[PDB]
Structures are given as structure tokens and as C-alpha cells.
Design a protein around this ligand. Structure first.
Ligand code: HEM
Ligand code: HEM
Ligand code: HEM
Ligand code: HEM
Ligand code: HEM
Ligand SMILES: [Mg+2]
Lengths: 306, 303, 306, 306, 306, 305
């Protein structure tokens, strides 16, 4: 089947649009979903090959029930709120995700405008974030972000639904969380203390050894193995965002996975901890203010809608 | 003397930072002004020649008197609110302008972060806009934006203070207005109707001929001839901005001129109207929610 | 398995369309050149890779085929079918060999055209030569974005590549060329809104007109074909602007590839002869076809094995 | 104070050379186009800045000057001087206006040429139109690097722009154009070493032959000129490859700018009429001039102030 | 399933070739780095993407294989076979580990080389370190385009990657390295025509000499090899210029990847021992091999899983 | 006058060639000097505009006397060896400098090859360094290198000989030193400790406050004010180089100045120290193994021989 552009080339700009569908908004939404590929072509084609404009469209659990009368993707459910001893992963409203990426913010904005034009009156905006690449693929904590993402066949194997849910093959599960950083608290750490928090060297992005990597580092808690001892993997495209005047320095977290169980296991280790880690130290400097789970179906699922 | 980067090469990204100096914030502000060129080099240098990072720093009339003793720039005064028959050009608070431009937002955001971090607790944010290049130098109305800006020597005679105010030579006057657009109304016009509002053909960016250019087109009202019959010019770097969710479709207007009078003449013709023109038809689709005037000194002045 | 020619090229800014006839006795020279044309393409192109994007798709006409080769022929290979509509005519013009040369740069196309024609000197007569150039944001001389609804990836291969329906010629394709000249003065007399009604898409934003407003005689309405099984019948186009300002020649070089000529020829019949609902494609009221040729572009190994 | 036209252009990979004659009574229309030509350059080009690099250098012939303007003539303006050499002829061909249009892309050149001709259609007759393209690593149709010894910076400004010697026309220049067609068959018949003896430079490495080896009838030998003070007399060239493979047209469009036409004309006399040591420039044994025209390209403000 | 190393790399302008031997007791340190080398590639390369194009292909010699790994050996892995020809010798020199590091920039190559050699310090003895740079037009130190006839796509995969014939090692390849020093004074004494007869291609145009013209002792004649089924036997090369102007060192670092070492060895036999028609490859009259090593470059996941 | 490309656009790649002129090599060198700009165009023009190929040609004090009749440049003299309490700036032989830069090492190598092709048997190689910039203009110590270089008119003012020595106007003075780093010792410091050595922040390249910048930091000691109480500036294009096998991790230092006195004062502060600093902390991790001074004349001086 034909996947949406979950595996995107390198992109320097992104818009995350999360909306809820208003009472009676379903027909307008279905019409828009049947045209969303066509609208990405209308905005993007003229700018190819360099524009690299794509939209990954996601649908929430409750939205799915409202929109489609047939089978549901096997792993689709509302985002699971996590109430950890110190940190909380909040569950916030979100029926439709538009994960818009390009080499330029103008292409993202132009597509977001077309999509919201078609949806005006049928949806209510919940979140809008304009993400930007920050230096050499760094995030707002100044660490390279995306290093250990799977690539090529491993990325497709990690992200794209297959024979386990054949009606939904080539779909994926997207988890979003908007994080705001305490940059005063962070900049109070030495680089070495920051490296102990993340689990990688700051300037050179080399993973700390097994012997020095803390158990409560971000890398330690988000490194997960299945029972066969193979790494369980997700595909992240985290995007810096913010407003200097309001002291908002953010990471917009997005992780794609073939099943949400992997992303949810990483989140549990982060927020609830383990026997050797109280919680992910990154959360002592990062507050999640959104949390939503969406299924991003195969492109042909959206194209074939009435 | 050496100007700030008022005459910047074209940039695809910008941050417009307007702040008020809090009571007691003067010394922190003067120390930052000392270092703003150094912070620009610190953030920008390593981004090669492609980064094109610059910050143009401007000081408002009220701020000037709080910050500096002695002579004031000849043309420095607060933004003049225009109460037109239909359209208003509001005057809004602004002591400091940071006009940050680069080929990338990150360079703009990183330099904005350095500047605001130094001023934290000395200033109150008034406005912050993250501008992006829109297609082939187009604006939110879908028209090419910058076409008739002066270049080279003509740009320097238009924007840079010279012998007429010797102690402020190499400075400029910046006027900013944040505009929000009625895109629903605008998209209601035929392309031909839109071309009559702007005064240029939409796709080809060809100026309408004298015989068909409406007197209340944007181009007609912002074309000003001086005492000698030559064009009085300004240098604009207008930037699209917005939020699709809140239906904010924005033009951040910034015009630089040797003297505020040229920019002020254009605003009066636009908002107050003329014998031949009720007002600039662009204002039937564009609302000004800020208006501020700044003097952007010579680089040497800031130290 | 059979290696296709580069029918599916990444986007290219420059093209040379070279159409020649094979002179009496020229067949042996042509066969030698056909066995070397892939080798010449590597000679010119390799040093400019990866950005050069140089390729040549070689096509052979119906009459030329029978002059060059013995035994089985491509199932759909026939001379271009002249269409005499009530208003507009699609002429058939001579053409035995097509070289469809594309690159990121005209020089690579020019150099390869020179190598090919140097090998065919004394064996072929020039019929048509057009040097195409990208025109702003993938626009044509009518000022509309051209290529937006092309199929991509697997859908593109399915549309253009001969397969099991003609297995001896699997990996080949059918190219239809028509050199069009536009009446720009006539076109510029129409409002943008009237032009959008002719094409069926919005001019600046390239958004397809809604089903309620798209005219039945619009280009997009008449070149949108659904098969009896309900699926879209697709072709892959690489239309190239060309012209001469002094001669007031403003053209579209139309090239369309399809796994059978039937799809392309259906679109042509609808355009030139119209339907129940449309006298003819309104684009032809501003566009004159001055050439018409059909070629079979065989699998690369067919040409190499000669 | 005088603003030159873009005589000294950055390197541009595309050009259009448009030479036209002014019809009887076409003067008023041409004067209006000259007063608008910079505004049309901005209309087409500004949207593509900074990478587009679109410029038009507008040139006026000797006869055309007298039809269009009263007051002073530029000091060096006269019709191109036909050279009738013992073997080779530099023909004088009609041309009243030159538009030398350059950009990083042909589309911009073509769009600007289209706007200019749209204004002049009823007032002028096209005489020559050439679409030039960069060929490999700044090479010409003879396979040699072309432009190497051009002056740059201050030296170029001093060699090209009218100053104190003609104060009313300061910031102008003199353009000599010649369209050359090459006998590529004959050229490729030479060894690389024989080609190097014709040009005066090493072919692949572009290293100038030493004084002891450089033939006196080499191109470099005859187009190397010294003034009375003994310093080099220089022109600024922007020669552009062009051609048509089917018509076997392999062209160099020669254009040379000089502060006075006398430097360019001495080079032409040495090439075509030869010296004590050289019958003629050996490049002419492989190159035939089919046009020859001389233009004054005035300061931009001279054209604006019409 | 199996993940090949970046044997099939995008064209790269920079390379570092590192050959080391494993000291007494160096096995554990080496295995640890082998398990980390992909991780270190990402640490250095990710933050430089997508322009960086950093990769490292890691090879293991025959002797080193038995020191490091339990279980099966690759079926074709053996020490480099010295060829003592009538005139020229293919020397064998020591090498346990190969790091074939490539990127768009030498500084990225050097950063990865640093990390690898930092981990190996005290466990290995450096044998050879070459910093390769390609010329503008994929041209080598002899001034010929180098890579033209490399296979691409499926044919490259077919030629290079171990498949069903040795299934435990599928996705691996065999690397042969030879560092060549050129006699540039002797080479530059030849005419271009004479140099073309040595290589078997035209120097400027990179057009292959016809079978009737290509000398039997030409580099292209002797390295063109057919199977027992008449099909081409191919290898994938990425030869890099290197050297030192002070020391008058002008080199080609040869690296050839093949599914079996037998194809590369057949080519080396033809070059150094000649045929019935050729004493030896004329390229060796200007090129001396000073190193020779054979390595197995396993599937990436073989090294990852140590 | 036409300066050489001393004020170059940023370049990723460099070759530094230092040679001595053999006995009887003067005429061959003179011929090469008269052609070196011609050769730079030969290799560089067809690579434009992205190639950014230039060569700056420098002549040492002793060689000037062997090569030229006429006036000597005012400031030209042998590099002065500095014997500090801890660190030494060695003086090493050098008659000709070829400072070759481009976006690509192949362009540098092609030009170095044509230059050394012409000088074969007239000169002896002393140093050859192939330099590579890290991305973001970072050096072998991981720091952005070039940040406070003067630009535009300020750079012209700091670098080019003017009316002070009008027969050599458009010239400049190049000091070279090849530094080998102790990378193991360097990578032992915290980022914070390295920032105290350099005097700038590592990731953000923001200069340390006056209140925290150590007096023995590299920025503090290479920051010079003249009598006027205004900045004495040089123009640097330092290039990482090395060899992983030999554990050679280097910075090739090159500084251009209108007069050598400015560069030499910086070297005196670095190596001999001040009232408030024993020596430049950068020298605790950097050993100079070469040191030479050249005059890089106006291009037209070399052309007109
Ligand atoms: C404040 C929010 C976050 C920030 C700033 C952040 C930043 C980073 C950084 C700097 C790395 C190391 C480089 C890399 O491999 O990408 C990393 C790795 C990773 N992060 Fe995050 N991250 C955040 C949230 C999350 C969340 C919520 C999850 C999962 C639900 C997650 C999953 C991962 C994974 C799986 C890795 C790779 C670990 C490995 O296999 O080495 N991250 N992140
Ligand atoms: C909603 C706000 C604005 C928008 C969208 C806008 C857009 C444009 C456009 C599309 C053009 C034509 C192309 C060009 O030459 O740049 C233009 C021209 C111009 N605008 Fe604006 N503009 C705005 C506000 C202003 C304001 C407030 C001023 C002056 C105070 C101004 C002064 C000019 C001038 C001087 C020109 C050049 C006219 C000429 O000489 O042809 N604009 N503007
Ligand atoms: C005569 C000059 C022609 C011009 C200027 C032209 C131009 C265009 C334009 C502007 C579009 C809409 C954008 C797109 O999807 O590409 C389009 C679409 C199309 N054209 Fe053409 N066209 C021409 C001739 C033809 C011919 C002769 C055919 C078929 C034989 C054809 C087949 C198509 C198809 C299939 C589409 C896509 C329609 C859809 O599925 O939405 N065109 N063309
Ligand atoms: C007919 C086709 C022409 C071709 C193919 C051609 C080609 C070349 C080439 C390959 C060079 C050497 C590299 C360089 O640009 O410096 C050159 C140099 C030159 N050409 Fe031409 N040229 C032609 C006609 C002309 C004409 C008609 C003139 C003068 C009226 C001219 C004047 C020059 C000059 C002045 C030089 C520089 C010589 C020097 O100082 O080294 N060329 N040309
Ligand atoms: C001095 C060392 C070498 C140099 C400078 C060199 C250079 C070249 C050049 C210029 C080509 C022509 C363009 C191309 O197809 O890549 C070529 C082709 C080739 N070289 Fe080499 N080569 C060298 C050593 C070797 C060695 C040692 C082998 C094999 C063990 C080899 C195998 C080949 C092969 C197979 C081809 C392609 C021939 C074909 O099928 O057309 N080369 N080489
Ligand atoms: Mg017409």
C-alpha cells in the first residue's frame, strides 16, 4: 500500500496543527481528508524538488469513531495520561493532526492555510506550533536531536503497520507532546551535568559508555529491547519552537511507530521510571503541556473516502 | 561613518523585537547596545557567508532622552497616530527595536535569545513577530513585495543620514507597523480588482500604466516626488507572518528613510487620503495594530 | 528482469526533444547508435553526477520499427492517429526516432544530442528539435503550473511501464509528442477567472476547481479518465516550455508516456473531438498542435542487446 | 553619480541576445521602452533575487542614436566597421537596439525579452535572437575555457566604463557583438596540441602557453594588445555558446565591452587583417562571423531620464 | 533482512582510507569499536546531514577474521594475492582492518577517523592513511574521468553484495585496496591521443574508444571481463586522488568492491600478467602499486550484533 | 594598487607551501612570481563562482635581498624567535610562502602542483600543510575560529600597507606558525575550563564578560590597544590539519597585518606573558614547530617584474 510521507527527507521547517472536530463537522472533515494529498500537490509540486513539502495527516481514536463506520486500527486509543510520582504526561484534546514539513516555512504555512480554509466552521484549533531547525540539528537544550533514528528498511520496519493489521498496512501511530523547557534551570548545569541528563556528549554527540551513562539519562530510559533482545525503535522528528519575549523555549516531540506500545513503553520509563531510575532527568527541565495519539493511515485510505 | 546593516542583502527569515525600557533598566540597555554588534558576530560568524545574520537596533524618541544626554537626531519624534476618515494608523509603545534578519530563523532566534537574555528584567516585551519569505518574495496578499526598493547608491542616498545631521551620519529612521489582513474579503476580489488595489499586475509584477493605475492604488499613493521632481524613496523589508489557527495573516511593515518625513508623507496619503484618493485601498484589507518610529544609529554610536 | 529507460526522470530544468527520420539505407547506422546510446549517456552525464540528472529516452516509430527489426512488435505501436475534430485537428507529422534528453542543465542535453547526431550523420534527416526550459515555478507559457497531477513512484511505474499484457516488451513505454504553439494575445484577453475555467485549476495557487465549478470543456475535466473498473487511467507528462520572442512563438512541448497508447489517445479524442458535454478542450482555443508523433521507448536492455 | 547598466555582471549561465531594427516611425515607442527597461528588469527579476541575477544591458546603434536623441553623440559611436581580410571577413549587419539579457536561468531572460518585445512589437523588426547557455566549466563550443583573462574589479571598471574623456556619457560602455558559427568537423580533426597552438592556451588545464611556444597567429597572441604606456589594453567579454544539433549550428556569440570601441576594433583588425607575423587569427579558420554590430550602452540614468 | 554497509555510496569528493593491523591482545578493543562504528558514524555525520553524506565501510582481513570472530568465514576471504608479472608487480602489504571513510568534506572524514583511531589507540598499528580528494569532474590524477562504467542500481547490488551463494554473509562485499604512485612527468610527456590509447577513453569527452580502436593493452580493454555465460563481470570502484606536491607524490588510491574477490583478481591478473594480445595494462607504465590488501566488509548488522 | 587576495572570502580548504630558494634559484623564482596570478586564473577561473581559488605569495627577509634590487618593505625582517619562561616561538627557514585557498582541496592541489612544477630544482620544500575547516568554522580545539577578524574597510585598514610605506602600498605581512596540539590534554578539560583558556563560549561563540574573562585567556592576550586606545587588529585564516595515524592534530596559524609589529606584540604577550598572565593558556595545549615572516606584495608588484 501507499504510505503517507512518515519517512520524510531532512526538513528545516514544520507546522504541527492539532484541531478538534465540532459537532456536525464530520462530512467537511471527510471531504478535506479525500483532498489533503491533492492540496499538498497544489501547494508543493510547483516548488519540487527542493521544497520537500509533505503533510502527514493523523486521526485520533474518538475522531476515528465519528468519521469511519468500519474497522479501527488495532492499536488506536486516546493518549494514556501518566501520573508519575514527580512528572505528569498530560492527555489533551486532539482529533486531527497535520504534521506539515518542508525545506521552507512558507510551503508549510500555505498548506496549513489551504487545509484550515477547507475546515473553517467544522473544527476548533487546539494547538499550532511553527518548528524550525536549530543549528546542526540541535534542539532547544543544545543537543543534537534525531541521531539514533532508524533509517531506510529499519525505519520502514519500525514505523509502518504490516501483516499484523493488514486492513491498515502502511499506516503508522503518531504521538505528539509539546514540551516547554526551564532554560534558566538547564543553563545552571555544567555541560558535563547536561551530558549526564541526556546520555550523550553535547558538542560531538557521542553516546556516553555503558559504565558512565546514568540509568536516569534520557538515552538510557528511551533505549528499549523486545523479548528477542532486539532494539524496539521509533522515528522522531522533534522541532524547536518558541518566543523569546515570553521565555518559551520548546521541543515539539513527535514519534512515529508501527504500534503505540513502543512509544508508550518509552513514555512509562520516562514519567513512571524503573527499578534503577526515578524518572527521565530531561523532565526536570521539560514540562509536557500537550499529549495526543493519532493513527496516520496509508495515503490511499484518505484518497478513497466519500 | 559605518552604518548598521540597514541595506541588508535579501533574507528569507526575520525577527522583529519591540520592547519598552522599564524604570531602572537604562544601564542594562546601554551595556547591551555596547555588545549588540559582538553578539551579532558571535551568533552569525560561524554561519559562513550564507547566514546573512544582521541586527539593526533602533531607539525611540522617549527612550533617546532616558538613554543619552546631548544632541538628538533631527527627525526623532514619537510615531504620529493618523485618525483617517475610515482607517487609523495607531501609535503603540516602543523604546527599542531589534530588526533581526538572516537566511534562516534559527540565526534570528539565537541572536534574539542572546539580546533578550542580557535585557531580562530591564525591558518589557511589546511585540515579537517571526517573519518568513512567502514564495517568490510575495506577501500575504499574493503580490511581489519589494520590487521598487532603491538599490546601490540610490538606496544609500534614500536611507542614510548625511551632512543634513552631521553628528548622526550613517543612521536611519525605521517605521514599523504590524498589519493583519482580511484574506476572506481579499479573496472575494477578482485578480483584476486586486491589481487595481495594489497598482501592479499580480503574476507578472508589471506596474499598471499611468492611464489605468487608480489614484487610490497602493503604488499611486506611496509614489512621492520631492522638491526637484525626483522620487522620494524609502527602503522596505516587509515580512509575512501569521497563525493559521487564529486566522492571523500578517504583513510586518518596516520602512527605512534618511528622514521620517518621506515615510510620514506616504502614511498620511494612505490613511488621511488626498484630493484624488479617499485612502489607500490596501487598507480596506489591512489593519495596523502597531505603529512605532525608531532612530537606528551608526554602528560606531552603539560602540 | 528488464531495465526500463529513464521514462520516470526526477524533475529536470532543461530538455532537448529531437525527432528525426531514418534515410533510405540508414537502418544499420541507427542500430549501431541504438546499441551505444546508454553508453553515450554515461559518457556525457557521469562526470556531472549526481546533480547533472542527464538521461535520454530513445523512442522508435511504427514504420521505423518495421524497417529496423524482424519478428514480434510492441502490441500498440502504430503511427500517430490524426484527429480531425469539427474545430481543432491533431496533425500526424513524420518521426522515426525520438531522443527525449533531460538534465538539470541544457549543456549536458546539448552535448548528448551532439554525440547522438554525430553518430547518425548521413543516416537520418532532422524533423524537429526543441530546447525546453523550466519556466518559473514549473509553469507553462499559459502561466499555469504544469505536471501537478502526474502519478509518482509505483503508481507512475504502473501507468507507464509495459508489463504482462505484452511480456516480450515489458519495461518499455509509449511516448506521444505534440509541439504546441499558444496564441498568447488571445489568452491574455481572458480574465484570470476565465483562464482558470479553461484549465480547471486556480492559476496562482494551482488548486483544482471544485466539481460544482469545473467546466466539462476544461482541460482537467477532458484529460481526467476513469476506466470501466473505476480506477483513474493515468499518463506521465514532462511538458516543456519553449519559444522565440522575435517570432512571437510561445510553446508547450507536450510529451506523454503510457503503458498503452489507448490511454493517451482517449485523452486526445476527448480534447479534439469532445464528448456529450464538451465540444472540445477549451485549451485548444489557445493552443495549435504543429506536430504529432507516437514512439515506442523500449526497455534499456532491448537497445543494448542490438 | 552616474549609475552604469550591469555591464559588469556576476557570472551568469544563461543569456538572450536580441538585436532589432527600429521601423520607420518606431522612435516614440522605442524611447518609451528605453525609459521603462530598468523597471521591466525589476518586474521580471526582483521576485527571483538574489539568485536570479537578471540584468539587461540596453545598447543603441550609431544610426539609431541620430533617429532617437538630439544633443551630443557618445564620442566613439559609429556603425560597425566591416573588415575585408585576405581570407576572412568581419561583416557589418543591421542592428539599432541590443538587449543583452543575462541571468542564472533562461526563464528570467526569456520573460524579460518577452516584456521588451511586447512593448516594441509594432515599432521594431527582429534581426537576431540567440539563447546562450553555459557549456561545462565555462567552456565554449571549441572545448576551451572562455573568459579566463577578463579583467575583474577596478581593472574591469577602468577598461569598460566611459569616464572624464566623455563626461556627458560617463558610466556608459561600447558593445561589439559578432555571432560566430564553428566548423566543428574541421576543429575535432586537430590534435589537442594543434587546438592549443590555435587558441594559445592548454585545453584541459587552461594554462597559457609560454612566450617561447605561443604561436604569433594564436587567438591569445592576436587579442593581446598593449597601449602607448606599454600596459595591456583590455576588453570585458561574456561569450555564450549556442546552437542547433539538427542544423549543425555550433556557435559562439561574441560580446565585448570597452570604454572606447578602439581597443575591440584593434583586436578585430589583428584577427581579420593580421600582423607582420600572422596572416590572421587561426580561430577564424574554424569560426565564421555571420553578424557584426556596435552599440553604445549608456548609463542607466540616461535611459531612465528619457 | 540484512543491512549492507554503505558500499554503494552517493558520489563523494572526500575520503580517508585507514588500514591498520591488530597488535597482540587488541581483539577485545577492536570488537568493541566494530560494535560501535555505525554508532560513531551517526555521532559525527547526523548533525552534518543531508549535505555531509558521511559513511564508513569497515573491512576485516582473512587473518584478522580468525582472531576476531567465531564460526564461519566468508567463502572468498583470503590474503591479497601478490602478482609478480614479467614487468609490474601487485605487492601484498599488511592490513587487518580497513576504514573506507567518505563524505562531501574531508573534515567530516577526519572527525570520524579521529573517533575510530581514538577507540583503537594501543590496540592497532597504523599501516596506511590516505586523504583522498576528487577533481571537479570526477577526474583522477591522470586527468581522466574515473567511475563512468561503474554499475548502478540493481546491477551494482548484483555485482557487489554477497547473496544466496554464501547466505551467512549476505549483504557483505569484498574490498581490494591498492595505493598507486604515478610518474606524472612521464604521463605528461604523452600526447592526449597517446594517453587515450593507454586508458581506452577520450580524455575531454569520456566517450569510450570503439572495440576496433581501443588497444588490447588499454586499461578499459583489460578490465573489461565477460563470464562463462557471455555476461559482463563488474566491480564497483571509488578511486581517489591523493598526494603531496613537496614530495612529488601524485597518487590514485584504488578500491574495488565485488560480490566475490575472483572478479577483482581476474582484472588484476589481466593488468599485471596480460593476455595473448597484451603484455600488461599500459596504465601500469605510469602507476606503481606500493600497497595491496583484501578485506571482507560484512553486513552492518554483523558488526552491530558483536 | 591591486592587493593579492589577502582579504579572501571564507574557504573550506587550504594548502600552505613554504620553500627555501636554492643557490642560483633566483631567476626561476622571479619567472614563477611574474606568472603566479596567471596560474591562479588558469586553475581557478573555470571553477568560479564556487571554487573561490586564490594564492597569496609571500617573500621572506633574506630572500628579498637575493631576489630584488630596489627598496625593501619597511617592516620586513626575519621572524624573531621568542624564548618564553615556559613556551618558545621557534624561528624556522622560509623564503617563499604560497597561501592557497579554495572551497575544494583539489583546486588548491592543482594550483600548488603548477607552482611547484615551475620551481622544481630551484627550491627546497620546508613545509606543506593541507588544511580543512570543520563545519561552522570550528578549529582543532572545537572552537569557532575567525569570529573577531576585522571585515570591510576595517580589514583593509588593519591588513594593507598604505602611505606609511607607499612603494609597497597594497602589500601585507604574513606570519605563519604550524601548531601541534596535545588533544588528549585538551579533551581532559571541561567545556567551561576550555572557555576560560580561549575566552569565548564554545557552543555559542559569545565572548566571556570582562568580569570572568581570564587575563591569561587567548582572547585577553591577543586583544591589543595602541597609543590612541583603539584596537590593533590582524586578519587570521587558521586551518586545522593532521594525520590520525601519527596522532598529529594541528592548527596552521596565519596572520596578516599592515605591519609585523602588531602580530609580534600579540606573540610577545602570548609567549612572554604580561603583569597579570604568565603566558597564553592556549600554548599549554599548542606547540609551535614553525615560525616565519613574509611580505605579501601588491599583485601588480609580482606581475610587473
Ligand atoms: C523534551 C523532550 C525531548 C527532548 C528535548 C529530547 C531530546 C533527545 C535527544 C537530545 C536525544 C539524543 C539524540 C538522538 O538519538 O536523537 C534523544 C534521543 C531519543 N529520544 Fe528524545 N527527547 C525528548 C522527548 C522524547 C520522548 C517523549 C520520547 C519517547 C516517547 C523520546 C524518545 C527518544 C529516543 C527513542 C531516543 C533515542 C534513544 C537511543 O536509542 O539512543 N524522546 N532525545
Ligand atoms: C499591508 C501593508 C503593506 C503591504 C502588503 C504592502 C505591499 C506592497 C506591494 C505589494 C508593493 C508593490 C511592489 C513593491 O514595489 O514593493 C508595495 C509598494 C510600495 N509600498 Fe507597500 N505595502 C504595505 C504597506 C506600506 C506602507 C505602510 C508604506 C509606507 C509607509 C508602503 C510603501 C510602499 C512603497 C513606497 C512602495 C513603492 C511604490 C513605488 O514607488 O512603486 N507600503 N507595497
Ligand atoms: C496543449 C498544451 C497543453 C498544455 C499547455 C497543458 C497544460 C496542462 C495544465 C496546466 C495542467 C494542470 C496541471 C497538471 O496536473 O499538470 C494539465 C493537466 C493535464 N494535462 Fe495537459 N496540457 C496540454 C496538453 C495535453 C495533452 C495533449 C494531454 C493528453 C494527451 C494532456 C494531458 C493532461 C493530463 C492527463 C492532465 C492531468 C489532469 C488531471 O488528472 O487532473 N495535456 N495540462
Ligand atoms: C569567434 C569565437 C571566439 C572564441 C571561440 C573565443 C575564445 C577565446 C578563448 C578560448 C580565449 C582564451 C581564454 C580567455 O578568455 O582569456 C579567448 C581569449 C580572448 N579573446 Fe576570444 N574568442 C572568440 C572571439 C574573440 C573576438 C572577436 C575577440 C575580440 C574582438 C576576442 C578577444 C579575446 C581576448 C581579448 C582574449 C584574452 C586574451 C588574453 O589577454 O589572454 N575573442 N577567447
Ligand atoms: C592507477 C590506478 C587506476 C586508475 C588511475 C584507473 C583509472 C580508470 C579510468 C580512468 C577508467 C575509465 C572510466 C571508468 O569507467 O571508470 C577506469 C575504468 C576501470 N578500472 Fe581503473 N584505474 C586504476 C586501477 C584499476 C584497478 C587496479 C582495477 C581493477 C582491479 C581497475 C578496474 C577498472 C574497471 C573495471 C574499469 C571499468 C572498465 C569498463 O568496463 O569499462 N582499475 N579506471
Ligand atoms: Mg499574437
Amino acid at each position: 500500500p501507499e504510505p503517507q510521507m512518515v519517512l520524510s527527507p531532512l526538513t528545516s521547517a514544520a507546522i504541527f496543527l492539532v484541531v478538534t472536530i465540532d459537532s456536525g463537522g464530520e462530512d467537511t472533515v471527510r471531504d478535506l481528508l479525500s483532498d489533503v494529498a491533492s492540496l499538498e500537490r497544489a501547494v508543493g509540486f510547483r516548488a519540487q524538488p527542493d521544497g520537500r513539502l509533505s503533510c502527514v495527516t493523523g486521526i485520533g481514536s474518538e475522531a476515528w469513531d465519528r468519521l469511519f463506520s468500519g474497522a479501527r486500527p488495532a492499536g488506536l486509543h486516546p493518549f494514556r495520561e501518566l501520573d508519575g510520582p514527580v512528572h505528569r504526561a498530560v492527555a489533551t484534546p486532539g482529533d486531527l493532526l497535520f504534521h506539515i514539513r518542508a525545506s521552507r516555512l512558507d510551503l508549510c504555512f500555505a498548506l496549513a492555510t489551504e487545509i484550515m480554509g477547507r475546515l473553517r466552521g467544522a473544527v476548533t484549533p487546539q494547538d499550532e506550533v511553527h518548528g524550525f531547525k536549530y543549528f546542526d540539528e540541535r534542539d532547544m537544550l543544545g543537543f543534537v536531536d534525531g541521531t539514533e533514528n532508524p533509517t531506510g528498511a529499519a525505519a520502514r520496519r519500525a514505523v509502518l503497520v504490516g501483516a499484523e493489521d493488514p486492513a491498515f498496512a502502511g499506516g503508522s501511530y503518531a504521538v505528539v507532546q509539546k514540551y516547554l523547557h526551564d532554560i534558566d534551570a538547564w543553563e545552571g548545569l555544567s555541560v558535563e551535568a547536561q551530558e549526564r541528563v541526556i546520555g550523550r556528549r553535547k558538542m560531538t554527540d557521542v553516546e556516553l559508555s555503558d559504565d558512565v551513562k546514568p540509568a536516569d539519562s534520557h538515552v538510557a530510559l528511551t533505549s528499549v529491547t523486545g523479548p528477542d533482545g532486539s532494539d524496539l525503535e521509533i522515528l522522531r522528528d522533534n522541532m524547536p519552537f518558541g518566543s523569546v519575549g515570553r521565555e518559551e523555549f520548546g521541543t515539539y516531540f513527535i514519534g512515529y511507530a508501527r504500534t503505540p506500545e513502543v512509544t508508550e513503553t518509552m513514555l512509562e520509563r520516562m514519567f513512571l521510571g524503573t527499578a534503577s531510575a526515578p524518572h527521565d532527568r530531561i523532565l526536570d527541565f521539560s514540562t509536557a503541556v500537550t499529549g495526543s495519539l493519532f493513527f496516520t493511515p496509508a495515503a490511499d485510505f484518505l484518497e478513497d473516502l466519500s
